[PDB]
Amino acid sequence: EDEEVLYKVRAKLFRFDADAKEWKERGTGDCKFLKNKKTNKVRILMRRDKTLKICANHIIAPEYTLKPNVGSDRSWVYACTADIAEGEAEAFTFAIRFGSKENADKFKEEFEKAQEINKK
Amino acid sequence: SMEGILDFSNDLDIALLDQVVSTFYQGEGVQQKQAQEILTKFQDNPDAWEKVDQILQFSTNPQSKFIALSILDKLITRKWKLLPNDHRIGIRNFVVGMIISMCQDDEVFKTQKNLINKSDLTLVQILKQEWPQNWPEFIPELIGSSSSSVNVCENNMIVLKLLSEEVFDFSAEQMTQAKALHLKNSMSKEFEQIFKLCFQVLEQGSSSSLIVATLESLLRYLHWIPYRYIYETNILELLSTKFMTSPDTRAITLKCLTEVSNLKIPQDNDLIKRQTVLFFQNTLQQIATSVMPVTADLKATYANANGNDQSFLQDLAMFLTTYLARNRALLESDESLRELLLNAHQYLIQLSKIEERELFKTTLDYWHNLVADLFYEPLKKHIYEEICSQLRLVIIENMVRPEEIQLYKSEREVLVYLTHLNVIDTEEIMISKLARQIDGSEWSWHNINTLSWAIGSISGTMSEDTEKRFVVTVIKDLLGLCEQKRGKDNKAVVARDIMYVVGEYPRFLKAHWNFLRTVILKLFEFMHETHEGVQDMACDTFIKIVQKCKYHFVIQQPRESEPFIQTIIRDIQKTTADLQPQQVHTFYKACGIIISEERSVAERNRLLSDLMQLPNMAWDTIVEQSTANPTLLLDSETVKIIANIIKTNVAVCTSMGADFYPQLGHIYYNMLQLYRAVSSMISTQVAAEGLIATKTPKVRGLRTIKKEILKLVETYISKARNLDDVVKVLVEPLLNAVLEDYMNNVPDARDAEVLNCMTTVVEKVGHMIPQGVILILQSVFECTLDMINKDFTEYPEHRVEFYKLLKVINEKSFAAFLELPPAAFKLFVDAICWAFKHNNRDVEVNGLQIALDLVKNIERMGNVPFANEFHKNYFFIFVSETFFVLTDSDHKSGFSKQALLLMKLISLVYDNKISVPLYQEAEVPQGTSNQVYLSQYLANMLSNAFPHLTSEQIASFLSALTKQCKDLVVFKGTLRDFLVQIKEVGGDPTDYLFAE
Amino acid sequence: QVQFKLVLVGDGGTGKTTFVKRHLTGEFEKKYVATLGVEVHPLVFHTNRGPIKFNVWDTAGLEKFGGLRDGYYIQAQCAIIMFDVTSRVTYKNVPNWHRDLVRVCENIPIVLCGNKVDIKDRKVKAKSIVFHRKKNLQYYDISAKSNYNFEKPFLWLARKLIGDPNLEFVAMPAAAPPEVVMDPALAAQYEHDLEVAQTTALPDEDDDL
Ligand SMILES: O=C(O)c1ccc(N2CCN(c3cccc(C(F)(F)F)c3)CC2)c(NC(=O)c2ccc(F)cc2)c1
Ligand SMILES: Nc1nc2c(ncn2[C@@H]2O[C@H](COP(=O)(O)OP(=O)(O)OP(=O)(O)O)[C@@H](O)[C@H]2O)c(=O)[nH]1
Ligand SMILES: [Cl-]
Ligand SMILES: [Cl-]
Ligand SMILES: [Mg+2]
């Protein structure tokens, strides 16, 4: 790999479907923060258990903000402007849920550290 | 333009249909989808059948012709009898002609198998309608046409196979009993001629595709034909020699010989016994010489998955296990058949090593049958010693974890039987497998785990003395293995396997107090290891050991100052300090199991007091602060502490049941005050924030407190011994705390667990609280019905708990329904019928049981005005609602209970056990019996619901039904006959006279 | 890239569409919307032998929505037969689905799948499931909801169709994702869409994830 793993955590990812006004699960597996050894840019790369299919692939943009979901104390929702998991870069409203509040808070800490690395 | 074919006013353009069909089968995305919809509407047009002979003649697309035959099949199976005789003979002759024509063209026969097979099935649908009564010559003409061509002969074998399947294999659900019997007797009467042809083809041989089609039809025949066609002809010899040698015929021949092994055969005939031996000997000889020797590595062959190897090896396992399970006694007492017997078993040993779970299970079912036999049958085990030795290694190397329930059970049972048959061989294999873990040659997590599960599985099979030496040897070896291993991953794996093994040997632990004590203290040390899996395994091992050895924790052991339970309780804070909440609850549950062994009341109550010390002190300080200032609950962290206190009480109440009462009594009053305070907080959070509040972590936390309180009370009441205290102390405060709160919350804030708690209360003490049951119904009945009577989907837990509560009230306190005002009683009848329409099998089954029980409850009242008014108002509602769910094809899972309910309703009238006329006066002569009026009402109801039935069909059906209303199996037969006849036109009314 | 027609058959409500959708998008559809005739979707897996494409014909199990019925099976190269381990009738009907399927598709690899093994009250016990043995079907316990063995039917069919018993699903390398600039004109657009999404609860808040 041309990338260093900064953080790895088990997570479930959702995307908001505005039409059906509901959260639709996109995958479950290891969410990884990967630092490109050439550009030093940190991305989220998430693969599904067993199929290993990509369900998240985007830069941790400095302009993104993690917000609580009304339902959860172990989730974050954020707008992503360019995710290439399904191919052509698309904008999503994402929600990512972890096994515990501690995992979610640790994720937030790591996501901010990555935002600062990406500011350089 | 594709939609052109849906316009029936204009003649059909075959080239357009061919394009739509091509677009559907070969097109993509939106175009495929649109072609799909158009083709469905085309096929479903009730006049589309008139287009079939046009499409069959003038279409170039074989997919169009396939879809044309589907349309024809709907006409033949549903509406055939509406056609004039001339038209039916016309279709019949066209279909036969189209089949013969396709078969006589070598190019079409080779490449259009789909369309020919579909044509053959269409012909078989015609035979089901026409044959033999309106087509006596069909079989003679098929036999005749078979010598004219090898293609026609082969295709005639496909027709006869499909006919045999339709008549003998799939008739049960698809035909009336009378029509199934008719076609079975018809095929039976003409089979002599069919068999003669099949035998000639198999003898005369030559074309492999023809031979394979003939053996495919034979496989179907073997489900029903008499043994003499197999044993009194050359056919057994051909199957077990010639057809085993060529690989084209081998797979089908093996499946035939498996069904031959299942024929009904005379038991007292030496010639037949010798023929049964011979075909087996011949089959195994052809395998050994033409396929693979007994030594072959079938694991390797199967894995390589060349050609049809996997299917062949599956079929061989099915043949060997089927034949040997029936016939191995034939091979056991004759010295000249010993080699055949052991070679057959050696093939099974090789098949058992294949890495394929479902194949392994098939061979394991056989091994279970064999070793069970050797355990009980005199003078047999010695025959199989070398087979059994190899099988011990196969089972030990394939042992799965006990979480795989059925497979672990099957494996354990086989290994236990094998251990009894030779304990020394079992021990040596297990110790030598352990040695190969210790020397690293076979070391892996999977391998030490599988071995530990195997060693665990045979606990209780050795003598106590042999077990003692074996267990010490195994623990010493696993301890050495642990020391020897490096890094916490490896050590954790071996530590979990030591805990596993020790937990499976309670007899050993019970005999060796010093060992047991050390194990527990070691488990307590492991409860501080954060290394994943270790705390969970320590807690699981602790409760498993306690369940089996509890008596040893409650007595004073020699050279101890106190019962060990006192030592566990004294140090409980320290022991459990690093556990997650669910692990603490297991730990407290285990302590509850021990304490319940103490049968001295004073000493039990004191141990229970000491165990509950930490949660009771956390509780007391919260109740002081919580009541002193209510706003302290809103705090997320206190809600988590309160829920965990209640859950600890649930855990200890689960293991102590009746003995838990003094602890419940200590918290009961303040627990129900806390229920009220948390209810207020939920209510006012929903008011302030909206229905979304119920999704918030805070409100879910509060609701968790309410659900654990209801769980604690239902857990105690379900095991309570003193029901007087339940009624006098518990019930009144419970109803006051929960019923109005449930009623006066918005649907989305109502806990389905309230219904579950009330079900247990009515179940256990319903007879003793008639006024409490009335209050339960008044609080939950109408508001819960209104949540679930708009659709079948909303509030699924309320739905299930609602009908469980009505069921128990209707069983235990039916007087509560007598107290309902007429309008509420009408809603109860509506609720029952509503349950009948459900597809969810929980609700439907409770629905039908309530209806049964309610009818029984009304019958019990005898000849009084409430019973009479019930029948006048509801008898016909239950009869028509039950018939609705019987006949609409959407409620097949409820068939048995629908039938039982309908039988009860019809038998009430047939016995004259309803005092008043069911008809309102001047609707019939005033003398008229309820039997005559029920006849009339059902005839009218069925005629309007099924207008295509004749008056004769309905009258015969109802005549059969009323005569059979004391015989459930025959009654159900008549109901299933009716469900077949309503799917077609011109069902024979004489079918309802069927008798076996 | 090699594409194979896969036909999915079994009683209504057994989980055919749910199982496929989970494989296409990753989502779990809780609602029962009965299939009308057939839904066709391409489904691609990446293997150590390159990509394999299944053209998935997800057929209707309900008789009244059956459409072309066995017409859908024409030129299938593989099949899944689905039942629900919580509904005995759905297993009783497995021989009827198998009959209708193999009359059209005589020599294809077929997986039998008992779905919904996540539900505690199982009605079709392991001991009862033997139909696959004489018919040479592969069998898996699955759950579309928990993802228990969710990949196994496709992995087994891929091994059979490619003729490689050691075929594995692999991870495809993930392209470096674009760095983009948030459009100042749609910044108001996004705060709205995020408001709606923060105030709609995530489903299944009691699950391990
Ligand atoms: O006769 C006795 O009084 C006696 C007392 C304790 C014994 N032990 C059995 C318990 N034990 C043990 C060690 C580590 C883990 C566990 C586990 F918790 F069960 F996992 C148990 C090792 C010590 C054993 N059994 C042994 O095999 C043993 C004991 C001490 C040794 F140094 C070596 C062997 C015997
Ligand atoms: N608990 C549970 N529910 C499931 C599972 N798979 C599917 N379901 C539910 O089952 C219901 C029916 O699913 P569908 O996929 O629509 O069923 P289907 O077989 O396609 O139905 P037809 O199209 O009518 O043949 C839905 O409510 C699903 O959410 C599962 O693994 N577990
Ligand atoms: Cl026998
Ligand atoms: Cl009809
Ligand atoms: Mg569907």
User: What range does the domain containing C21 cover?
Assistant: 2-209
DSSP state letter for C83: E
C99 and B165 Cβ atoms separated by less than 8 Å: yes
Rg of chain B taking only CA atoms, in angstroms: 37
Alpha-carbon distance of B699 to B695, in angstroms, equals 7
3-state SS class at C54: strand
Name the residue facing C132 among B67, B310, B358 (closest C-beta): B358
- Cross-chain residue pair C202–A63, CB shorter than 8 Å: no
Both structure tokens of B373: 């036999």
Token pair, residue B664, equals: 């419940």
Ligand 4 mean position to B14 CA, how many Å?
28
Contact B165 C99 (CB under 8 A): yes
Rounded to the nearest 10 degrees, the angle between the axes of helix B636-656 and helix B601-611 is 160
C207 touches chain A (CB under 8 A): yes
Question: What gap in Å lies between CA B347 and CA B357, rounded to an integer?
Answer: 17
Closest ligand 1 atom to Cα of B502: 19
C-alpha angle B76/B82/B85, rounded to 5°?
85
Nearest to C89 among B162, B303, B892 (CB): B892
For residue C81, the one-letter residue type is I
Q: Is C165 helix (H, G, I), strand (E, B) or coil?
A: coil
Question: What are C3's strand-pairing partners?
Answer: C53
Name which of B437, B537, B452 is nearest B501 in CA terms.
B452
Collapse the DSSP code of B6 into the 3-class scheme (helix H, G, I; strand E, B; otherwise coil) and give the result.
helix
For B727-761, b/e burial (b = at least 16 CB within 10 A) is beebbebbbebbbebbbebeeebbbbbbbbbbbbb
* Separation of alpha carbons A52 and B439, rounded Å: 36
**CA dist., res. B464 & res. B645, Å (int):** 43
Quote the tokens at residue B739.
């019923």
CB-based contact A23:C27 (threshold 8 Å): no
* Whole-Å CA distances, B328 to A52, B344, B361, C53: 50, 10, 20, 48
Q: Given an 8 Å threshold on Cβ–Cβ distance, is C71 in contact with B70?
A: yes
- Segment holding B653, helix H or strand E: helix B636-656
Residue of B nearest to A69 (CA): B696
What was the elucidation method?
Answer: X-ray
- Say how far apart CA B21 and CA B39 lie, in whole Å: 7
Distance, in Å, from the CA atom of A7 to the CA atom of A9, rounded to the nearest integer, reads: 7
- Contact assessment for residue B103 and residue B116, using Cβ atoms and an 8 Å cutoff: yes
> CB neighbours of B517 closer than 8 A, spacing ≥ 6?
B557, B564
| CA C61 to ligand 2: nearest atom | 25
Distance CA C47, CA C156 (A): 12
User: Which of B843, B905, B844 shows the shortest CA–CA distance to B878?
Assistant: B905
In angstroms, the CA B426 to CA B324 distance is: 25
Cβ atoms of B538 and B532 within 8 Å: the answer is: no
Task: Assign B722 to helix, strand or coil.
Answer: coil
What's the CA-to-centroid distance between B514 and ligand 1, angstroms?
9
For residue B304, give the DSSP letter. Answer: H
Subunits next to B (3 or more Cβ pairs <8 Å) are: A, C
- Contact B696/A at CB under 8 A: yes
SS3 helix, strand, coil % of chain B, rounded to 5?
A: 80, 0, 20
Q: CA C138 → CA B307, B311, B314, distances in Å? A: 16, 11, 11
Cα–ligand 4 centroid distance for B835 (angstroms): 28
The helices-and-strands tally (H runs, E runs) of chain A is 1, 6
Contact: B695, A73; criterion CB under 8 Å = no
Query: Chains with ≥3 Cβ pairs under 8 A against A?
Result: B, C
Q: Is C173 on the interface with A (CB under 8 A)?
A: no
Ligand 2 center to C14 CA (angstroms): 5
C-beta neighbour count of B578 within 10 angstroms: 12
Mutate to test the pocket of ligand 1, among B448, B479, B494, B529 (most ligand atoms within 8 A of CB): B479
DSSP A90: E
Q: What single string gives the DSSP state of each residue in A5-18?
A: EEEEEEEEEEEEET
Question: Is C148 near chain A, with CB under 8 Å?
Answer: no
Q: Atom 9 (ligand 1): residue with closest C-alpha?
A: B515
Which segments of B242-295 does DSSP mark as H helices, in order?
Answer: 242-245, 247-260, 270-290
Rounded distance, CA B775 to CA B816, Å? 9
Torsion over CA of C23, C27, C28 and C34, rounded to 10 degrees?
-70
Cα-to-centroid distance, C136 and ligand 5 (Å): 25
Given a contact cutoff of 8 angstroms between Cβ atoms, the answer to whether B315 and C136 are in contact is yes
Q: At a CB cut-off of 8 Å and minimum separation 6, what does B332 contact? A: B341, B380, B383
Q: Is the CB of C141 under 6 A from ligand 2?
A: no
Whether residue B283 contacts residue B240, with contact meaning beta carbons closer than 8 Å, is answered with yes
CA distance A116 to chain B (A): 31
- Fold annotation for A1-120: PH-domain like (2.30.29)
Q: How many CA atoms lie within 13 A of C103 on its CB side?
A: 26
Subunits touching C (CB < 8 Å, at least 3 pairs)? A, B
Q: How far is A12 from chain B (nearest CA, A)?
A: 18
- CA distance to partner chain C, nearest, from residue B95 (Å): 18
Reading the block at residue B893, the tokens are 């899972």
| Dist CA B414 CA B417 (whole Å) | 5
Task: Please enumerate in sequence order all residues whose Cβ is within 8 A of that of C129, keeping only pairs 6 or more positions apart, or say none.
Answer: C91, C112, C114, C139
Question: Mapping DSSP to helix (H, G, I), strand (E, B) and coil, where does residue B316 land?
Answer: helix
CB B466 within 8 A of CB B420: no
Nearest to B991 by CA among B180, B187, B163: B180
In this complex, the residue of A10, A54, A99 whose CB is nearest that of residue C174 is A54
Please, which contacts does B156-159 make with residues 24 or more away whose CB atoms are closer than 8 Å? Answer: B157/B198, B157/B201, B157/B210, B157/B213, B157/B214, B157/B216, B157/B217, B158/B116, B158/B117, B158/B120, B158/B213, B158/B216, B158/B217, B159/B99, B159/B120, B159/B123, B159/B124
SS3 B654: helix
Say how far apart CA B886 and CA B904 lie, in whole Å: 15
Cβ–Cβ under 8 Å, residues B576 and B651: no
Are A52 and C179 a contacting pair at CB < 8 A? no
Contact B160, B961 (CB under 8 A): no
Number of helices (H), then strands (E), belonging to chain B: the values are 52, 0
Q: What is the Rg, in whole angstroms, of the alpha carbon atoms belonging to chain C? A: 20
Q: Is C29 annotated as a binding residue?
A: yes
Nearest residue to B430 via CA among B460, B471, B468? B471
- Partner-chain contact B695 C205, CB within 8 Å: yes
Cβ–Cβ under 8 Å, residues B64 and B20: no
Rounded to whole angstroms, the Cα distance separating B473 from B466 reads 11
CB neighbour burial string for C34-45, b if at least 16 within 10 angstroms, e if fewer: ebebbbbeeeeb
How close A16 comes to chain C (CA, Å)?
A: 6
- What is the distance in angstroms between the CA of the first residue and the CA of the last residue of chain A? 22
Chain pair A-C, CB pairs under 8 angstroms: 117
**Atom 20 (ligand 1): residue with closest C-alpha?**
B499
- Which residues of chain A are within 8 Å of residue B636 when distances are taken between CB atoms? 73
Does the beta carbon of B405 lie under 8 angstroms from any beta carbon of chain A? no
Is-contact C105 C76, C-beta < 8 A?
yes
Measured by CA distance, the residue closest to atom 34 of ligand 1 is: B476
Domain span including residue B497: 1-995
CA–CA dist B485, B493 (Å, integer) = 10
User: Three-state SS for C62?
Assistant: coil
Angle between helices B752-765 and B796-812 (to 10 degrees): 20
Burial of C25 (0-12, 13-18, 19+ CB in 10 A): middle
CA distances from B842 to B748, B835, B846, B883 (A): 22, 9, 6, 20
How far is the C-alpha of B848 from the C-alpha of B845, rounded, in Å?
5
Number of domains in chain C: 1
Cis before B132 (ω within 30)? yes
Which residue is closest to C47 within chain A, CA to CA? A51
C25 assigned binding-site residue: no
Contacts of B321 in chain C (CB under 8 A): none
Indicate the Cα dihedral angle C16, C20, C23, C24, nearest 10°. -160
For an interface test with B, which of C40, C83, C207 has the most B Cβ atoms less than 10 Å from its Cβ? C40
Place of tokens 């057929």: C59
Is B181 strand, coil or helix? Answer: helix
Sorted by where each begins, the domain ranges of chain A are 1-120
Query: Distance of alpha carbon C120 from its chain centroid, rounded?
Result: 21
Instruction: Choose the residue to mutate in C32, C57, C152 for probing ligand 2, maximizing ligand atoms within 8 Å of C-beta.
Output: C32
Burial tier of B221 (Cβ tally within 10 Å: 0-12, 13-18, 19+) = buried
Is there a binding annotation on residue C11? yes
Rounded CA-CA distance B760/B719 in Å is 10
Enumerate residues lining ligand 1, CB below 6 A: B 472, 475-476, 479, 495, 498-499, 502, 514-515, 518-519, 522-523
B230 C-alpha to ligand 3 centroid (Å): 21
Q: Quote the DSSP letter at residue B49.
A: G
Where does B632-767 show beta strands of DSSP type E?
A: none
Q: From CA B138, how far away is CA B133, in angstroms rounded?
A: 10
Integer-rounded Cα radius of gyration of chain A: 14
Q: Which residue has the tokens 């609701």?
A: B703
Helices (H), chain C: 16-25, 88-92, 94-104, 131-135, 152-162, 187-198
Taking a C-beta distance cutoff of 8 angstroms, is the pair C5, C72 a contact? no
CA distance C160 to C179: 42
For residues B858 and B814, the answer to whether their CB atoms sit within 8 Å is no
Q: How many CA atoms lie within 13 A of B45 on its CB side?
A: 19
Strand, helix or coil for residue B346: helix
DSSP 8-state class, residue C73: G
Alpha helix positions (H), B105-234 = 106-111, 113-130, 138-146, 150-164, 171-174, 177-204, 208-221, 228-231
Which residue of B lies nearest to A101 if distances are taken between CA atoms? B697
C162 in contact with ligand 2, CB cutoff 6 A = no
User: Which residues face C78 on adjacent strands?
Assistant: C6
Determine contact: C197 vs chain A, CB below 8 A: yes
Residue positions counted in chain C: 209
Q: For chain B, what is the domain count?
A: 1
Angle at A30 between CA A29 and CA A33, to 5 degrees: 145
Give the number of C-alpha atoms closer than 13 A to the C-alpha of residue B493, restricted to the C-beta side. 17
Which chain B residue has the Cα nearest residue A68?
B696
Cα(B891)–Cα(C89) distance, rounded to whole angstroms? 10
